[PDB]
JSON list of C-alpha atoms in Angstrom, two decimals:
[
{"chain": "M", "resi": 2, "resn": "UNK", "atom": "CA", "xyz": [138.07, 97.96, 78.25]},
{"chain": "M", "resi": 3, "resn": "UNK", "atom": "CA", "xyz": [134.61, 96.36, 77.69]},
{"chain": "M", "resi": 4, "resn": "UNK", "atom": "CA", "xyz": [132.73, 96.68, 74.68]},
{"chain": "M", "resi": 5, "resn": "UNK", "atom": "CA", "xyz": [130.28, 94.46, 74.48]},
{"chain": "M", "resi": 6, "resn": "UNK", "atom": "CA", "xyz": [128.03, 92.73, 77.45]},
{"chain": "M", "resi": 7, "resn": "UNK", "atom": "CA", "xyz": [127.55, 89.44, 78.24]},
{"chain": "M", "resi": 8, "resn": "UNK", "atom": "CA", "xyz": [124.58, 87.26, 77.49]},
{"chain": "M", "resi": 9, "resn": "UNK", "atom": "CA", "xyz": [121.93, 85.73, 79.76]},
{"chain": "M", "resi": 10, "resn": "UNK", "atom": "CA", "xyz": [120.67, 82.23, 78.28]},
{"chain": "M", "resi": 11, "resn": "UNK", "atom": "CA", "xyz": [124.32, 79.84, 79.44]},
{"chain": "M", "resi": 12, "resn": "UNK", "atom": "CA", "xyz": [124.17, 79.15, 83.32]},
{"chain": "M", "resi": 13, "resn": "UNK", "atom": "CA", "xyz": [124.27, 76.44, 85.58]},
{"chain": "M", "resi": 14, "resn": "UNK", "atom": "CA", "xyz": [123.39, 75.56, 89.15]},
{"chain": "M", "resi": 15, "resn": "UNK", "atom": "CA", "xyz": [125.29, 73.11, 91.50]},
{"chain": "M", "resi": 16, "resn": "UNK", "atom": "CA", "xyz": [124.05, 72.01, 94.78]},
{"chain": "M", "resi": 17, "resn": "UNK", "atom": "CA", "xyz": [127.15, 71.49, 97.39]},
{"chain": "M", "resi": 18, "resn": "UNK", "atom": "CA", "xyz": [125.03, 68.62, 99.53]},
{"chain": "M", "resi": 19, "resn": "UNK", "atom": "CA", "xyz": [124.07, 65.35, 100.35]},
{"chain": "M", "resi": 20, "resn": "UNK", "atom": "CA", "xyz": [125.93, 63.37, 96.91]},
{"chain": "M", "resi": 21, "resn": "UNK", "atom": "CA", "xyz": [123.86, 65.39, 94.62]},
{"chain": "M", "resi": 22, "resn": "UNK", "atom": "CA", "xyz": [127.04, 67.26, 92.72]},
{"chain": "M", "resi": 23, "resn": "UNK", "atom": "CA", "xyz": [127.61, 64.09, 90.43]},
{"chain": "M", "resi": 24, "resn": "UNK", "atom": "CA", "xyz": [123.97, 63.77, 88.99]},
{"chain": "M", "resi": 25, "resn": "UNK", "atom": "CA", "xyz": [123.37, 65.38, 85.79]},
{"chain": "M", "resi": 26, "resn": "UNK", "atom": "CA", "xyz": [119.85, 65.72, 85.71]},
{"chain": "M", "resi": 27, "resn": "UNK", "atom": "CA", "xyz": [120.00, 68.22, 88.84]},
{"chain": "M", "resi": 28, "resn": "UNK", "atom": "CA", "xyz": [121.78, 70.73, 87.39]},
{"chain": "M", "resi": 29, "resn": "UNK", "atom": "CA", "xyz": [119.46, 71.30, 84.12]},
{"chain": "M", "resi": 30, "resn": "UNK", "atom": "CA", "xyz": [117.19, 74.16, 85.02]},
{"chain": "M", "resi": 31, "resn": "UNK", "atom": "CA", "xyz": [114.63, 76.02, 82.67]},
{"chain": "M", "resi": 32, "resn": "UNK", "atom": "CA", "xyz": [114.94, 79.22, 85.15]},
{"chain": "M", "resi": 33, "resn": "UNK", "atom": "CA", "xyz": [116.87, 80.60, 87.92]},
{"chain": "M", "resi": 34, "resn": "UNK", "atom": "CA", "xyz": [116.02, 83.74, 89.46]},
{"chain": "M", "resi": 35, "resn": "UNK", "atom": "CA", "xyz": [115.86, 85.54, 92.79]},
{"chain": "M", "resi": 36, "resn": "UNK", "atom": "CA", "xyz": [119.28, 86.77, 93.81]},
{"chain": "M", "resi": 37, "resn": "UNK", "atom": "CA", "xyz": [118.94, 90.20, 94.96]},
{"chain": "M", "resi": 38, "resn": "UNK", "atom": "CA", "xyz": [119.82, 92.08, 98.64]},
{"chain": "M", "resi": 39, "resn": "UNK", "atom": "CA", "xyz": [118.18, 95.27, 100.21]},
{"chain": "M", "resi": 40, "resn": "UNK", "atom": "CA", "xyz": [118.84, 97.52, 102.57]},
{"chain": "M", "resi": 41, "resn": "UNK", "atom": "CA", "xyz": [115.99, 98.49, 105.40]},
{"chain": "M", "resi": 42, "resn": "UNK", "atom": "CA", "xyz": [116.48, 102.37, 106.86]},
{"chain": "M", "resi": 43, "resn": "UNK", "atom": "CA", "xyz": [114.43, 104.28, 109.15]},
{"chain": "M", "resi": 44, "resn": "UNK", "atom": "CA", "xyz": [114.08, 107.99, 109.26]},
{"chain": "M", "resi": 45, "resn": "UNK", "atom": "CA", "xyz": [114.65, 110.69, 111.71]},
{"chain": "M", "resi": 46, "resn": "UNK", "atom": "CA", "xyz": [113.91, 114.61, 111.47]},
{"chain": "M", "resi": 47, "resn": "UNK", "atom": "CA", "xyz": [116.34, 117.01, 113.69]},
{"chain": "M", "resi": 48, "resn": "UNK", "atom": "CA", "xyz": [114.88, 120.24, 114.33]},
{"chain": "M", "resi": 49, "resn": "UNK", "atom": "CA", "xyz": [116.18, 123.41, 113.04]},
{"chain": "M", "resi": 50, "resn": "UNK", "atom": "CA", "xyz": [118.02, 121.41, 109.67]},
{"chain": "M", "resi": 51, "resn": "UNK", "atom": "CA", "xyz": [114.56, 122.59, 107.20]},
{"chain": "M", "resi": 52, "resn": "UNK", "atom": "CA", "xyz": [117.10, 120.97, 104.24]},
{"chain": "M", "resi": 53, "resn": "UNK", "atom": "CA", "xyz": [117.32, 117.12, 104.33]},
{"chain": "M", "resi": 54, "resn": "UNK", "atom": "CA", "xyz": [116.24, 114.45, 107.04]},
{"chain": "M", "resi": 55, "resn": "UNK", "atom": "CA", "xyz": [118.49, 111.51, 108.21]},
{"chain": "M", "resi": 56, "resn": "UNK", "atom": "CA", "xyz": [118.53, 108.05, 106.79]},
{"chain": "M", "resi": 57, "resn": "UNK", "atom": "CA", "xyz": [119.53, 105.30, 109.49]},
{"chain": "M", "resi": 58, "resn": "UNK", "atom": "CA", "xyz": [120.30, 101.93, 108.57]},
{"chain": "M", "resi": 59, "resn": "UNK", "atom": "CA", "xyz": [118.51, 98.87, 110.01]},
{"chain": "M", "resi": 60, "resn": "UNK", "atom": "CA", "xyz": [118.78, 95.43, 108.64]},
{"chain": "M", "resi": 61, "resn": "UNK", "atom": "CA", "xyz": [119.48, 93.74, 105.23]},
{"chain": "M", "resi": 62, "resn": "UNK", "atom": "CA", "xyz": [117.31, 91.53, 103.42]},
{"chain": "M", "resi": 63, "resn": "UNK", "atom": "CA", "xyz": [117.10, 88.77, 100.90]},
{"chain": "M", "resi": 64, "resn": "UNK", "atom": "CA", "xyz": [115.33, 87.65, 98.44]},
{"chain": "M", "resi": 65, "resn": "UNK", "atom": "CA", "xyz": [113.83, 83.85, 97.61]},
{"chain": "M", "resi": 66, "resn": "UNK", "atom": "CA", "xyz": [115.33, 81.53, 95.10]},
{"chain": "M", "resi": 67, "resn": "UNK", "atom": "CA", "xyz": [113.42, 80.44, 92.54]},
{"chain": "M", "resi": 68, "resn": "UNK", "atom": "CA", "xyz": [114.25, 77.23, 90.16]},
{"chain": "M", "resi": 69, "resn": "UNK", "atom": "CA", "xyz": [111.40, 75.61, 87.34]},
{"chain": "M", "resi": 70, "resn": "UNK", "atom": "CA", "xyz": [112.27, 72.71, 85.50]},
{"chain": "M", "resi": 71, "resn": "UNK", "atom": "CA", "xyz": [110.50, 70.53, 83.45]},
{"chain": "M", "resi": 72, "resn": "UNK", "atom": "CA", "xyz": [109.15, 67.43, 85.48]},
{"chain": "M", "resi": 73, "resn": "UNK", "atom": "CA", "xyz": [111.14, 64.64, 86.60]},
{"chain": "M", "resi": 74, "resn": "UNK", "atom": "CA", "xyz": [109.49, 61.83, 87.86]},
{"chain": "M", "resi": 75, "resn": "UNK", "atom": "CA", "xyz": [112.24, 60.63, 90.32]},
{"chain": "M", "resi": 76, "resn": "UNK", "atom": "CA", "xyz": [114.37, 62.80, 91.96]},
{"chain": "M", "resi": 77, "resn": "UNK", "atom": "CA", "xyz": [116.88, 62.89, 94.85]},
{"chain": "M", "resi": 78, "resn": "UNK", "atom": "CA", "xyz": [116.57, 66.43, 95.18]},
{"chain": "M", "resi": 79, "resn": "UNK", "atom": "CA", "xyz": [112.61, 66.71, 95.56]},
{"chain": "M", "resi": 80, "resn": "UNK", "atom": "CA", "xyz": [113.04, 63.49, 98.43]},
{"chain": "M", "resi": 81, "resn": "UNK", "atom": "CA", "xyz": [115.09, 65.53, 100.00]},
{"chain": "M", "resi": 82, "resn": "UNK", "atom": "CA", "xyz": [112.53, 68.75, 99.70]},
{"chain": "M", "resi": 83, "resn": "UNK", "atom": "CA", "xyz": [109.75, 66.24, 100.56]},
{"chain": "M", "resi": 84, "resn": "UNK", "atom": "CA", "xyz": [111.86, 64.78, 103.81]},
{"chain": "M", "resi": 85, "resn": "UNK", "atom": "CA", "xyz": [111.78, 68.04, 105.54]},
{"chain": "M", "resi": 86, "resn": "UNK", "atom": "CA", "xyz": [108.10, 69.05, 104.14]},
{"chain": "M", "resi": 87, "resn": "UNK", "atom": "CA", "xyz": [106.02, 66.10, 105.45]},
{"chain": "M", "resi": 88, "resn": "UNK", "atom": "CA", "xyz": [108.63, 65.11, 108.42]},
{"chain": "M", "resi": 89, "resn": "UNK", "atom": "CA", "xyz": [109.80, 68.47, 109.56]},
{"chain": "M", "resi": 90, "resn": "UNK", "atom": "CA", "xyz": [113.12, 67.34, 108.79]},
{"chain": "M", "resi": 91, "resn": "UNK", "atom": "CA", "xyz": [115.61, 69.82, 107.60]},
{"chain": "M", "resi": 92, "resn": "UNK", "atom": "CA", "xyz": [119.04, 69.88, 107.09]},
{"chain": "M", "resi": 93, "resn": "UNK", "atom": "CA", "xyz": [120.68, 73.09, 104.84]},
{"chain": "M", "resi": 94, "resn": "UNK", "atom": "CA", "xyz": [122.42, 72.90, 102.03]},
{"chain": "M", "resi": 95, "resn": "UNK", "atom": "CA", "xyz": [125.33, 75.08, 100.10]},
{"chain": "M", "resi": 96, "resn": "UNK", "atom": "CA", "xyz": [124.78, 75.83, 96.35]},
{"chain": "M", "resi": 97, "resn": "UNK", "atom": "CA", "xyz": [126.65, 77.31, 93.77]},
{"chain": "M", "resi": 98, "resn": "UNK", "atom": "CA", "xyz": [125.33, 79.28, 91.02]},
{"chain": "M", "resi": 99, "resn": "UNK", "atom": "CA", "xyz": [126.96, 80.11, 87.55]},
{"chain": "M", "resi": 100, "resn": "UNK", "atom": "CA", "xyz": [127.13, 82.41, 84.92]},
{"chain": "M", "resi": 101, "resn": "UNK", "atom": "CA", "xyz": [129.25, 80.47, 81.99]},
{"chain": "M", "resi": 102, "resn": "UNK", "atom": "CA", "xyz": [131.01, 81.60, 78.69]},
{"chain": "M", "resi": 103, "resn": "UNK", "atom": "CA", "xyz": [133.54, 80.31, 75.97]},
{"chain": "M", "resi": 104, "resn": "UNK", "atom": "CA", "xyz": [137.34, 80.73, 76.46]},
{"chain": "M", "resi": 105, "resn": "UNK", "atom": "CA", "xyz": [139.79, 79.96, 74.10]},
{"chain": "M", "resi": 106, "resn": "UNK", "atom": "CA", "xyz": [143.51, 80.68, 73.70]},
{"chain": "M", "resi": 120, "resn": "UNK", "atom": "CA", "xyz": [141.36, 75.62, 71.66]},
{"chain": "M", "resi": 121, "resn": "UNK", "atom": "CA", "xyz": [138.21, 76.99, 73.24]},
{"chain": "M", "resi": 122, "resn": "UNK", "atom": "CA", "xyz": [136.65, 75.79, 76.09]},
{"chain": "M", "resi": 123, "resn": "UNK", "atom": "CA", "xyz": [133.28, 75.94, 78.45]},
{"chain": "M", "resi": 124, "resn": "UNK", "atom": "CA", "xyz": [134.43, 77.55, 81.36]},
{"chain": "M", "resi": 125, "resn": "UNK", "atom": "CA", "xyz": [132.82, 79.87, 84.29]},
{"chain": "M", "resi": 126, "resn": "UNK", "atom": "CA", "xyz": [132.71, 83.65, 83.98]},
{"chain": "M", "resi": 127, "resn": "UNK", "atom": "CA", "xyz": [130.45, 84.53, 87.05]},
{"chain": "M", "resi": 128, "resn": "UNK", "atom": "CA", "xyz": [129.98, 82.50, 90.60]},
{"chain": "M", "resi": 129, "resn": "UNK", "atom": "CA", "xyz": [128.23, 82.89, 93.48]},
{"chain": "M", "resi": 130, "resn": "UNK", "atom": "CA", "xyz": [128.30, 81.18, 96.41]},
{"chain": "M", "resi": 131, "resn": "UNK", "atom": "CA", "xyz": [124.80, 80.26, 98.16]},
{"chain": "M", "resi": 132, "resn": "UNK", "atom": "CA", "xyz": [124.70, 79.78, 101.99]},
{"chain": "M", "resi": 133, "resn": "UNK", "atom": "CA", "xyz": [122.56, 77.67, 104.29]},
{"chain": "M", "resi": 134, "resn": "UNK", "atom": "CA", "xyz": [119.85, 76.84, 101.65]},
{"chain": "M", "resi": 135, "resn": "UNK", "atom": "CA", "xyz": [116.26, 75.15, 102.70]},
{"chain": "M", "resi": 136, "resn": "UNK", "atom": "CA", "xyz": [113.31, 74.21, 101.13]},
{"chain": "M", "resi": 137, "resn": "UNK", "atom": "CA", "xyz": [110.03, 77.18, 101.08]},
{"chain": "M", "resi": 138, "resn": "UNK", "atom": "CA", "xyz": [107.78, 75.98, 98.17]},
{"chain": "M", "resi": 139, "resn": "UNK", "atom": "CA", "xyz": [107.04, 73.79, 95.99]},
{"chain": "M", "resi": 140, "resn": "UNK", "atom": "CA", "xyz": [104.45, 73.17, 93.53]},
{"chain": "M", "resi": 141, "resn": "UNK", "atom": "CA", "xyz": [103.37, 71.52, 89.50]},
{"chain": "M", "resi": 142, "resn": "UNK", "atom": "CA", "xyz": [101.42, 73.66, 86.75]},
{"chain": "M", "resi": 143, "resn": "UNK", "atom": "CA", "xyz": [97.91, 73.00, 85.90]},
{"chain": "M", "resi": 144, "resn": "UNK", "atom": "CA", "xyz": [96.56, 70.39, 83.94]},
{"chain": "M", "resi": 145, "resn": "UNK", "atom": "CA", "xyz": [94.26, 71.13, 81.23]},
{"chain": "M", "resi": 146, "resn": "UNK", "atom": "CA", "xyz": [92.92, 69.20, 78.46]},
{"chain": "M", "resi": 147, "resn": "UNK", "atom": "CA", "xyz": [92.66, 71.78, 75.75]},
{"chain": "M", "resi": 148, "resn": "UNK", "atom": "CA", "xyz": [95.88, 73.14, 75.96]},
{"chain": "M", "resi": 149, "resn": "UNK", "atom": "CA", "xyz": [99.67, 72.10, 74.49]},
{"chain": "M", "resi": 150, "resn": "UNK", "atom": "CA", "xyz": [101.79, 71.99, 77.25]},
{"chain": "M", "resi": 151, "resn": "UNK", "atom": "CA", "xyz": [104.80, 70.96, 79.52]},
{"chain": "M", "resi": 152, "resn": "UNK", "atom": "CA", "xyz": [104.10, 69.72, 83.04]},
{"chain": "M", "resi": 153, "resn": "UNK", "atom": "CA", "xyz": [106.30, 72.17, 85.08]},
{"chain": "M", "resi": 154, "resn": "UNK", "atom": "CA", "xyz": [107.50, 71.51, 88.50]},
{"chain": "M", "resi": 155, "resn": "UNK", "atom": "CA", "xyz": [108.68, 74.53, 90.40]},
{"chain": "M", "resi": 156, "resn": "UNK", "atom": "CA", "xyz": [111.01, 75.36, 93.80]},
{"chain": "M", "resi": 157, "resn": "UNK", "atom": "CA", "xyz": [111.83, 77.97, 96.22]},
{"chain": "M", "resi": 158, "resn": "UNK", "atom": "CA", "xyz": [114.38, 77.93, 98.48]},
{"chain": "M", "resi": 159, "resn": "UNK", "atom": "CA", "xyz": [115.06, 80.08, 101.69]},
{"chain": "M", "resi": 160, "resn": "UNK", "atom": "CA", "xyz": [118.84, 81.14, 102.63]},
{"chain": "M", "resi": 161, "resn": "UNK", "atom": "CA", "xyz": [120.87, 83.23, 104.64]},
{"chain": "M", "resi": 162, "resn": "UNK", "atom": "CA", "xyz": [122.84, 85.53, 102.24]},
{"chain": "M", "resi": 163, "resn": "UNK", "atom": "CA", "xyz": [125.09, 84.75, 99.47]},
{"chain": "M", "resi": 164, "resn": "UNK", "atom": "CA", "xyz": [128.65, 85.93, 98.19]},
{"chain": "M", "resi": 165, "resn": "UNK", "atom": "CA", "xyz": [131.44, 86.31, 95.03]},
{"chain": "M", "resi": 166, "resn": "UNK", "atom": "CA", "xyz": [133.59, 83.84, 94.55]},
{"chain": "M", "resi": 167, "resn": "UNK", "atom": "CA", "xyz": [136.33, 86.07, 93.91]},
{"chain": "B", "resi": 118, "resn": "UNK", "atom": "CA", "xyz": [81.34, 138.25, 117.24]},
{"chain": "B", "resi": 119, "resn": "UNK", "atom": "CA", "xyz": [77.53, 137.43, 117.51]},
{"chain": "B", "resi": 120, "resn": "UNK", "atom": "CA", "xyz": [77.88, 134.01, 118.60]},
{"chain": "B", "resi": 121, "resn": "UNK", "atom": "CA", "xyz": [75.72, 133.36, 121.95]},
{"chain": "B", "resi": 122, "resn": "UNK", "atom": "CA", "xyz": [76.58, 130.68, 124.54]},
{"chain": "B", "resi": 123, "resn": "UNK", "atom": "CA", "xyz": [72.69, 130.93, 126.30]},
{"chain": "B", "resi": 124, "resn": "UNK", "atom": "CA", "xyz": [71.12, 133.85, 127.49]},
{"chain": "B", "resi": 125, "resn": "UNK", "atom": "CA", "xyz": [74.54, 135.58, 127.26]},
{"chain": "B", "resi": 126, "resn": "UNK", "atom": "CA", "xyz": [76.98, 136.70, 124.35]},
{"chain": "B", "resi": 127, "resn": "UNK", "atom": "CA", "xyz": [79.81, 135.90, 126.69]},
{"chain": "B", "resi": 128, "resn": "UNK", "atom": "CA", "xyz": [82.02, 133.70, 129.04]},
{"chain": "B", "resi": 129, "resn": "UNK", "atom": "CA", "xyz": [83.40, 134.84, 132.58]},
{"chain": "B", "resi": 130, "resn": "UNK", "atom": "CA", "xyz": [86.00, 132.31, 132.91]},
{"chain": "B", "resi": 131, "resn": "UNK", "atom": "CA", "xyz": [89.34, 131.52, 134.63]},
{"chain": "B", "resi": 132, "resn": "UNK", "atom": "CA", "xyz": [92.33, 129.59, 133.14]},
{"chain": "B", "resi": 133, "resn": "UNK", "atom": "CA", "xyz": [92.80, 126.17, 134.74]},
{"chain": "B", "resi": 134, "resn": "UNK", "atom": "CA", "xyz": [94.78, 123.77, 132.21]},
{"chain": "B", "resi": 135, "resn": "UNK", "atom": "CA", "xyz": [97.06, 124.71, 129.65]},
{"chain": "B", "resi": 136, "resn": "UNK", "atom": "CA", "xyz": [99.85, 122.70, 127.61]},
{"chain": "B", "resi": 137, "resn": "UNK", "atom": "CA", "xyz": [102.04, 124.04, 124.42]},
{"chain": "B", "resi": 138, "resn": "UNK", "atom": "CA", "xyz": [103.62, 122.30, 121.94]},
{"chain": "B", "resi": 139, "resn": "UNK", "atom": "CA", "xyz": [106.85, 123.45, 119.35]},
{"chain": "B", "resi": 140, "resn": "UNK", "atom": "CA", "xyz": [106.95, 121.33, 116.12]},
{"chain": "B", "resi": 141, "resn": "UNK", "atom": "CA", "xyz": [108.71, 123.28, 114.07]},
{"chain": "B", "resi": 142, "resn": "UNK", "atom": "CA", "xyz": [112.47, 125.41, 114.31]},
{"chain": "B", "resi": 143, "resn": "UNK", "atom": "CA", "xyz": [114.73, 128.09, 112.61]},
{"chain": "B", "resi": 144, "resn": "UNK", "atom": "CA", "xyz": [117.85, 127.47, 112.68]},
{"chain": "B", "resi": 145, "resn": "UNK", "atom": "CA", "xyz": [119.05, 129.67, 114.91]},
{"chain": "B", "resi": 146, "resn": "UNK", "atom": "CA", "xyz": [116.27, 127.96, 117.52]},
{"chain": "B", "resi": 147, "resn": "UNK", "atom": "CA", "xyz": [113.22, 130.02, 117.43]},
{"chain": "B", "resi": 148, "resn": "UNK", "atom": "CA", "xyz": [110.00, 128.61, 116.49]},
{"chain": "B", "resi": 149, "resn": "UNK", "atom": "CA", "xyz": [107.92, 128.68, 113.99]},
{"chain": "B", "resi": 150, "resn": "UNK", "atom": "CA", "xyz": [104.82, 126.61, 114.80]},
{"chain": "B", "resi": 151, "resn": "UNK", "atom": "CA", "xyz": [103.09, 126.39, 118.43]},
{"chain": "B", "resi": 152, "resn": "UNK", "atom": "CA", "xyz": [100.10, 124.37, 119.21]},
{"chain": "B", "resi": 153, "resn": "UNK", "atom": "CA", "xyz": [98.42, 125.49, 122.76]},
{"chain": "B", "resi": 154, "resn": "UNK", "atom": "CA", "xyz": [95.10, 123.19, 124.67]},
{"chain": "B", "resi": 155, "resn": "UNK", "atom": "CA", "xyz": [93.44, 125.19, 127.27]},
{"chain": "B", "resi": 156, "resn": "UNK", "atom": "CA", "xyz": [90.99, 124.06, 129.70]},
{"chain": "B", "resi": 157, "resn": "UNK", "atom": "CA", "xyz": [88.59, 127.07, 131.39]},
{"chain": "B", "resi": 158, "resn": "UNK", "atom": "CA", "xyz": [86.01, 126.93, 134.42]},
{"chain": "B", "resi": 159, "resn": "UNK", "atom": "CA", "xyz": [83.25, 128.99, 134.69]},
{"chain": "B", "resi": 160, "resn": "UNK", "atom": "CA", "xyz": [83.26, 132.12, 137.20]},
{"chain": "B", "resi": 161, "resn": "UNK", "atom": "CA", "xyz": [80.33, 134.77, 138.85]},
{"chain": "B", "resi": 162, "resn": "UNK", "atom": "CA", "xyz": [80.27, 136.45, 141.99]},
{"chain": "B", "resi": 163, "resn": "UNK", "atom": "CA", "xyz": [78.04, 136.17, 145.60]},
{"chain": "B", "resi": 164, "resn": "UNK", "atom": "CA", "xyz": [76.09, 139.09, 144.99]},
{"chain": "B", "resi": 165, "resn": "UNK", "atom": "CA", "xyz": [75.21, 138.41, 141.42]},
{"chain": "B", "resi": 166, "resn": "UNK", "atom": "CA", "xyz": [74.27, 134.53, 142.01]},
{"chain": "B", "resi": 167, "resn": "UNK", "atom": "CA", "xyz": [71.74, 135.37, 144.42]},
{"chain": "B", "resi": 168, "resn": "UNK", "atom": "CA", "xyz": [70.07, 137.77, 141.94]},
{"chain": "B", "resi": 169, "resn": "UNK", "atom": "CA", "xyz": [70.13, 135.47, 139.11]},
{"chain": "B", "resi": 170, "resn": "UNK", "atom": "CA", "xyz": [68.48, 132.74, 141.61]},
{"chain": "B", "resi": 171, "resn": "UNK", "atom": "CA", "xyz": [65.23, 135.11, 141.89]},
{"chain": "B", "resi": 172, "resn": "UNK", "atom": "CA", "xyz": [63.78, 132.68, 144.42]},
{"chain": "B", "resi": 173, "resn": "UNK", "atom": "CA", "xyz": [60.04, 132.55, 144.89]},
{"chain": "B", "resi": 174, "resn": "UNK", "atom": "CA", "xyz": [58.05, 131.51, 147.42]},
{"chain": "B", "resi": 175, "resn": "UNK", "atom": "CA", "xyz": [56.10, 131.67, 150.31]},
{"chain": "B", "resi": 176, "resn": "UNK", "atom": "CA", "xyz": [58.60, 134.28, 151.52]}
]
């Protein structure tokens, strides 16, 4: 039985495509966020029942995928992004994304959560602003469209 | 009450349209909100609308 919950800061993401598993640099994010689901309802009133309406279910929703890094100059990834922005060329990806903790039993790096991503595109894409006052990180951020994701249990 | 339409403190009317609407149910079925639209035309008889046309003339 649990007693303590796990920490945030140790993840990874893995994109299922094109050859871009084996390169290191694309699976170094500074965030990952966006993975929720909701439910769309409608309501309806029956007359005479004064206590409580009806809820109907509709549809199910998703939410965008959203990735920043700090930016690299030349990337596989963003050619790919940049191939179906400017030539209306897509072609969908799978991704992975993971939640990671130590195991031992002598310890080891291993997964604790995964979820699979399905049929992943490229939305948005856009760099922070440059300023010459300020101390700061050029930032390069992504967002991704998909169709729903899943466990791996 | 004291509210006057002319030279008169009434209408002589019949019914013409009328449409009712329920909204709102007990539960055993019988209403409890009605909203009613009524349309009326105005009535007055031979003899009287010759008198209130008090024609002059030559005659």
């Amino acid at each position: 039985i649990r007693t303590y919950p796990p920490v945030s800061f140790f993840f990874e993401v893995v994109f299922q495509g094109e050859n871009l598993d084996k390169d290191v640099v694309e699976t170094r994010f500074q965030s990952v966020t966006g993975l929720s689901v909701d439910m769309q309802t409608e309501t309806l009133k029956e007359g005479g029942e004064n206590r409580f309406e009806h809820i109907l279910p509709v549809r199910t929703k998703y939410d965008p995928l959203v990735l920043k890094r700090g930016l690299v100059n030349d990337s596989q990834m963003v050619k790919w992004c940049m191939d179906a922005i400017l030539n209306f060329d897509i072609r969908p990806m799978n991704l992975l994304v993971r939640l990671l903790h130590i195991e031992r039993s002598s310890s080891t790096i291993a997964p604790l959560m995964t979820w699979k991503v399905i049929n992943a595109w490229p939305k948005k894409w856009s760099v922070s602003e440059f300023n010459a006052e300020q101390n700061s990180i050029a930032v390069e951020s992504l967002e991704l469209n998909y169709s729903y994701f899943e466990t791996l249990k | 009450g004291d509210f006057s339409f002319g030279e008169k403190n009434g209408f002589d009317c019949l019914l013409t349209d009328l449409q009712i609407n329920y909204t709102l149910f007990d539960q055993t079925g019988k209403p409890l909100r009605a909203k009613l639209s009524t349309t009326f035309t105005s009535y007055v008889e031979q003899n009287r609308r010759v008198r209130e046309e008090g024609k002059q003339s030559p005659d």
